Amino acid sequence: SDKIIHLTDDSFDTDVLKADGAILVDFWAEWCGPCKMIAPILDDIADEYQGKLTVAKLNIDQNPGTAPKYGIRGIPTLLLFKNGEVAATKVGALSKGQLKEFLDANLA
Structure with a gap:
């Protein structure tokens, strides 16, 4: 919670x-x-990717509604959204190096 949006099921549409x-x-x-x-890595990404994207986190236990809508099974699952539409999907843990390559490739 500096740059990271702590999402809820009710806040998911807006956020x-x-x-x-x-x-x-x-x-x-x-x-x-x-x-x-991967949490400390997302802290890193949120800083490094100012103005390019926002990192948002949804805890699937405290917020049970949202994940079934996007077919989520394995966690962590990272979904890159561009204006409300999913562009890129990443399931499981990965490094900072791996995540940067995921984002750089898919942000373009």
Whole structure:
């Protein structure tokens, strides 16, 4: 919570679907080891990608509604949205190097 949008099921439309640009949503849970591995990396990305995209996190236990809409099974799942439409999907943990390459390739 500096640049990261802490999303809810009620805030999801406004925060993600109505945003004039790119949003990287992280579907995640507290018990999930790989999710917690990538949190510090998302902190990094949010800073590094100022003005290019916003990072948003949706905890799928506290907010149960949203994930079934996007077919999410494995977590973490990262969905790159561009103006409310999903452009790119990444399932499971990955490094900062790997995530940057994912974003750079798909933001274009």
